[PDB]
């Protein structure tokens, strides 16, 4: 049995290094949003809320984790607070991640009403509510769902603790049925699964809109060919009405002028078609190609480019949510083994330390994801560091 202070020294040193990086990187995120108006939007207010949770992991949760690794003597409910505080920060992160996903879904699904529905003032209120709920959920053991009524008195005596004190260790004070059923299943797993459902809807909505744009583009070009090889006015009329509906569906200044020219030219040709003048209708329909080459294809390309950027932004957000799940799931899975398999030897202490370090590393990774995936953050980071 090697001296406990040695393996402790490795765990503590790694924890302190992570805390430094979590503070530095996420302070940079907050400084960037504060300074760049192009970064000031509802999505990034939740990003800042998430960065604040990660700053508090470095300032508070990691010092608390180091403290409760020692098993020092503490009043049981004081031990409970420093043990449970990381649950507040993890819960706040989950709420911010879910809010970000929902924000991106509103933007892709109803962009015309996004600016009227999703405002900064409503966002600040949601953030406040989510922090209150995070304290309520994370500190629920302090309301009585704890093991302080049944302390490990033999462990307390062997450490010289006073009366009312326990050896302060996470699993000795926080009940495992709370950790598995309430914290993991209900408060972590269910919101992560909801997030997965939201992102599936976001990418399904984007794929559908990028299909719908190509279908309307195909309908405009296909029916142009139908008119050229038509032989009577009724075939021209049929293909023109289909073009007119495709044009109005695709419509939903230089943008409006291009579609006004298009529908007007379709109407010009339809009037000729209704009068039985096929050759004049076809010549009129040929004028549409000039409008298509100078306006309509430009709208189709820019609409595609806007959709691709929304997909890119949703993928960046989903990566962040997925990395949260990756870094936190090992701890929750270990707790499931401890709880559901009392015939299994407890996960060894080195593995507990590794799982805790991994969870804490998640508070380091988001600034790197923003830097590598969002140009506006990356360029703002560069200016902050240079200047």
Ligand X SMILES: CCCCCCCC/C=C\CCCCCCCC(=O)OC[C@H](O)CO
Ligand Y SMILES: Nc1nnc(-c2ccc(O)c(Cl)c2)c(-c2ccccc2)n1
- Torsional sign, CA 180, 181, 186, 187: negative
Site pattern 11..30 for ligand OLA (x: CB under 6 A): xxxx-xxx-xx--xx-xx-x
Q: Which is nearer to ligand OLA, 97 or 246 (CB)?
A: 97
Q: How far apart are CA 382 and CA 387, in angstroms?
A: 8
Which segment (86-94, 127-135, 141-149, 262-270) binds ligand Y by CB under 6 A? Answer: 86-94
Token pair of 120, please? 């900064």
- 182, 317, 327, 330, 331 from 352: Cα distances, Å: 20, 28, 13, 9, 7
CB of 108 to ligand X, least distance (A): 21
Give 291-337 as a DSSP string: HIIIIIHHHHHHHHHHHHHHHHHHHHHHHHHHHHHHHHHHHHHHHHH
Q: How far apart are CA 93 and CA 90, in angstroms?
A: 5
Binding positions for ligand CLR, rule: CB under 6 A: 74-75, 77-79, 81-82, 326, 329-330, 333-334, 336-337, 340-341, 344-345, 347, 351
Burial status of residue 106 (CB atoms within 10 A of its CB: 0-12, 13-18, 19 or more): middle
Which segment (70-78, 205-213, 243-251, 306-314) binds ligand X by CB under 6 A? Answer: 70-78
CB atoms within 10 A of CB 199: 19
Sites for ligand OLA among residues 289-348 (CB under 6 A): 319, 322-323, 325-327, 345, 348
Helix or strand run (H / E) with residue 74:
strand 73-75
- By CB under 6 A, the count of residues binding ligand Y is 13
Helix or strand run (H / E) with residue 75:
strand 73-75
Q: Nearest-CA neighbor of 60 among 26, 92, 86?
A: 86
- By CB under 6 A, the count of residues binding ligand OLA is 58
Q: Which is nearer to ligand CLR, 16 or 75 (CB)?
A: 75
Instruction: Answer whether 168's CB lies under 8 Å from 71's CB.
Output: yes
Partner from ligand CLR, ligand OLA, ligand Y, none binding residue 356, C-beta < 5-8 Å depending on class: ligand Y
Which residues contact ligand X by CB under 6 A?
4-5, 8, 12, 30, 33-34, 40, 45, 48-49, 52, 55-56, 59-60, 63, 66-67, 69-74, 77, 120, 122-124, 127-129, 131-132, 135-137, 139, 142-144, 146, 148, 155, 167, 169, 185, 189-190, 340, 342-343
Which residues contact ligand Y by CB under 6 A?
61, 65, 86-87, 90, 170-171, 331-332, 335, 356, 359-360
Which residues contact ligand OLA by CB under 6 A?
7, 9-14, 16-18, 20-21, 24-25, 27-28, 30-31, 34, 55, 59, 63, 66-67, 70, 72, 122, 125-126, 128-129, 132-133, 136, 319, 322-323, 325-327, 345, 348-351, 353-354, 357-358, 361, 364-365, 367-369, 372, 384-385
């Amino acid at each position: 049995g090697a001296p406990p202070i040695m393996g402790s020294s490795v765990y503590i040193t790694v924890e302190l290094a992570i805390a430094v990086l979590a503070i530095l990187g996420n302070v940079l995120v907050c400084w960037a949003v504060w300074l760049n108006s192009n970064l000031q939007n509802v999505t990034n207010y939740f990003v800042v809320s998430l960065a604040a949770a990660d700053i508090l992991v470095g300032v508070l949760a990691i010092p608390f984790a180091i403290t409760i690794s020692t098993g020092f003597c503490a009043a049981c409910h004081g031990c409970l607070f420093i043990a449970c505080f990381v649950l507040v920060l993890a819960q706040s992160s989950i709420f911010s991640l879910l809010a970000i996903a929902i924000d991106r879904y509103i933007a892709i699904a109803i962009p015309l009403r996004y600016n009227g529905l999703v405002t900064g003032t409503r966002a600040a209120g949601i953030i406040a509510i989510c922090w209150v709920l995070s304290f309520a959920i994370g500190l629920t053991p302090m309301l009585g769902w704890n093991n302080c009524g049944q302390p490990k008195e033999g462990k307390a005596h062997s450490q010289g603790c006073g009366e009312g004190q326990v050896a302060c260790l996470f699993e000795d004070v926080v009940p495992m049925n709370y950790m598995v059923y309430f914290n993991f299943f209900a408060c972590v797993l269910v919101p992560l699964l909801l997030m997965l459902g939201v992102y599936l809807r976001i990418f399904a909505a984007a794929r559908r809109q990028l299909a719908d744009l190509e279908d309307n583009w195909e309908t405009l070009n296909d029916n142009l060919k139908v008119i050229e090889k038509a032989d009577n006015a009724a075939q021209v009329k049929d293909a023109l009405t289909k073009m007119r509906a495709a044009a109005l569906d695709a419509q939903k200044k230089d943008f409006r002028h291009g579609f006004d020219i298009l529908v007007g030219q379709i109407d010009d040709a339809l009037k000729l078609a209704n009068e039985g003048k096929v050759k004049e209708a076809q010549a009129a329909a040929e004028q549409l190609k000039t409008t298509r080459n100078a306006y309509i294809q430009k709208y189709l390309e820019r609409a595609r480019s806007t959709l691709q950027k929304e997909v890119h932004a949703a993928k960046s957000a989903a990566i962040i949510a997925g990395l949260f799940a990756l870094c936190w799931l090992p701890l929750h899975i270990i707790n499931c083994f401890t709880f559901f398999c009392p015939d299994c030897s407890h996960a060894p202490l080195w593995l507990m330390y590794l799982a805790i370090v991994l969870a804490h590393t998640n508070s380091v990774v988001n600034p790197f994801i923003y830097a590598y995936r969002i140009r506006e953050f990356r360029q703002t980071f560069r200016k902050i560091i240079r200047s």
